C-alpha cells in the first residue's frame, strides 16, 4: 500500500493506477496492480497518463497509459526486456488486440476484439503473414484462413461459395460464386460498396438481400415474389445454418 490519502483512477483497461497527489524530483509517481503484480513508475502528469515491473519469471512488464486515458499497452518481455512475448493493447471502448510471439519475435497469435464484443482469432501465424483464422460472432462462428493480403472467411452450401473478405485495414467486401450453369438457379450476387450490402439475384429475380452491419451482423430482407421490391423486414442471423439457408 503506497498511499490512501495522497493517492486511484480505475481505467481504461480493466486496471487502476494510483497517481500521487510530487515525488523527490518533480514527477508524480504512480502505481498499478496487474494480475498479482505491482508496477511502479513516475510521470510528469497527475492523471494516470508508464509502469515497469518484473515477474517471478525474471521477465519484464511495461504497462503504458496514453496521455488522454484512451489506451493501455500492456507489454510482457523476455528476460532481456527487449524481446517481447505478449503485447495486449486494450482501448477505452473495450476494443483490444492481443498478440503472442515466437522466439524470433514474430507474431504467433493475434486476437482482435472489436468494441461490439465480436472476436477475430488468428492461430499458427506463419512467418509470411498467413495462418488459420476464425471469427467469433454473436451466436455463430465463421472460419477461414489468412494471407497477408486479405483475411478470408468462406461459407459454402453445395455449389455456392460465400466469401467474406476483409481488408488489412478494416474494410469489408463480400463475394459470391456459384458453379451451377442453370440460369434458373445460378445464384449470382452483386456487392454494393456504399451501403455494404450483398444482393442475390436468382433466375433474374432478386430473391433476397444480405447487409453487413458496421456492428458485425448479417441481415435478411427477402424480395417480393417477382424480385422487384423488398418484402417484410430485415431479420438478424443468429445461427450459421440460417446463412446456409440464405444460399439454399
Amino acid at each position, epitope marked *: 500500500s503506497l498511499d490512501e490519502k495522497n493517492s486511484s483512477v480505475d481505467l481504461p483497461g480493466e486496471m487502476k493506477v494510483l497517481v500521487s497527489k510530487k515525488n523527490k524530483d518533480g514527477k508524480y509517481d504512480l502505481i498499478a496492480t496487474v494480475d498479482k503484480l505491482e508496477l511502479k513508475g513516475t510521470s510528469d502528469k497527475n492523471n494516470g497518463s508508464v509502469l515497469e515491473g518484473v515477474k517471478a519469471d525474471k521477465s519484464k512488464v*511495461k504497462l503504458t497509459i*496514453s496521455d488522454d486515458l484512451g489506451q493501455t499497452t500492456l507489454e510482457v518481455f523476455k528476460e532481456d526486456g*527487449k524481446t517481447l512475448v505478449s503485447k495486449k493493447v486494450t482501448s477505452k471502448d473495450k476494443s483490444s488486440t492481443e498478440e503472442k510471439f515466437n*522466439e*524470433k*519475435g514474430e507474431v504467433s497469435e493475434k486476437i482482435i476484439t472489436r468494441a461490439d464484443g465480436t472476436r477475430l482469432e488468428y492461430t499458427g501465424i506463419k512467418s509470411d503473414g498467413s495462418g488459420k483464422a476464425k471469427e467469433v460472432l454473436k451466436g455463430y462462428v465463421l472460419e477461414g484462413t489468412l494471407t497477408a493480403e486479405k483475411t478470408t472467411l468462406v461459407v459454402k452450401e453445395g455449389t455456392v461459395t460465400l466469401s467474406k473478405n476483409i481488408s488489412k*485495414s478494416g474494410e469489408v467486401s463480400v463475394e459470391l460464386n456459384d458453379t451451377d450453369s442453370s440460369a434458373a438457379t445460378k445464384k449470382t450476387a452483386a456487392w454494393n460498396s456504399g451501403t455494404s450490402t450483398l444482393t442475390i439475384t436468382v433466375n433474374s429475380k432478386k430473391t433476397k438481400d444480405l447487409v453487413f452491419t458496421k456492428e458485425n451482423t448479417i441481415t435478411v430482407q427477402q424480395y417480393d415474389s417477382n424480385g422487384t421490391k423488398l418484402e417484410g423486414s430485415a431479420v438478424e442471423i443468429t445461427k450459421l445454418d440460417e446463412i446456409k439457408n440464405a444460399l439454399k
Partner: antibody
Amino acid sequence: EVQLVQSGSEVKKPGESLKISCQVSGYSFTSYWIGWVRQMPGKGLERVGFIYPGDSDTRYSPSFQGQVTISADKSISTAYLQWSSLKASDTAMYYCARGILRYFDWFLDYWGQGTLVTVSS
Amino acid sequence: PSSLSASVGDRVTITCRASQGISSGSAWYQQKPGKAPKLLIYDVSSLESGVPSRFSGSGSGTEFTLTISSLQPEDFATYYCQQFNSYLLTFGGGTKVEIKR
C-alpha cells in the same frame, strides 16, 4: 560486454566479389537477429537485410534481393554480407547490427565499428 | 536533411512526420561524425540503457517526438527517426544540431 567486430576496409574493382564479416560476442548469437545497414557517403542509413542464426532465416530489403547475399556461422558467431559482382554504386560504409523485429522492421540495438567499402575502376 | 542551431541548456523537440501513417511506434538514433550510431529511444519511450534522463521520446499515430530537456555538449550530433510503418526503408533524412555562437 557485447562487441561487434567487423572486418577491415576493402578496396575493389567493378566485378570482383567481396565478403564482409561481423563477429558478435557478449550474447547468444542465435537467440536474436543480425543485420546490415548501408550508409552511402554523406547520406542516411539503409536497411539491406537481416537473418536469424537459429534457423538461418534470411530476409532482404526489396532494394537488394538478388543483388546481395547474407549468411552466418554459429560455430564462430560470425555474420556475413557478400556480393557476386560489385558495382561502383555499392561504394559506402556498411554497418552490422542487432535487430529486434517490430512487426515489419528491426530497430538496431548494438552496432559494429566498420566497415568501409571503396569500389572503383 | 535539415539542420538546427541551439546553445547549451536549450530545450529541443525533434518532430518526425510520416507520409502514410500506420506506425505502431518509433525509434531514435544519435550519430556523431565518423562513429557508429547510438540507440537512444525505442518503443517510443525506452530509454536505452546508458542514456541521460534528459532524453525523452513520445508521439502517436504518424507524428513522433524526441526531446532533450536541456542540451549538453555531448548531445551535439545528427539525429535520425525510425518509424515502424509498412513504409520503407531508408530512415528519417536526419537532423543535425549545431552549436550556436
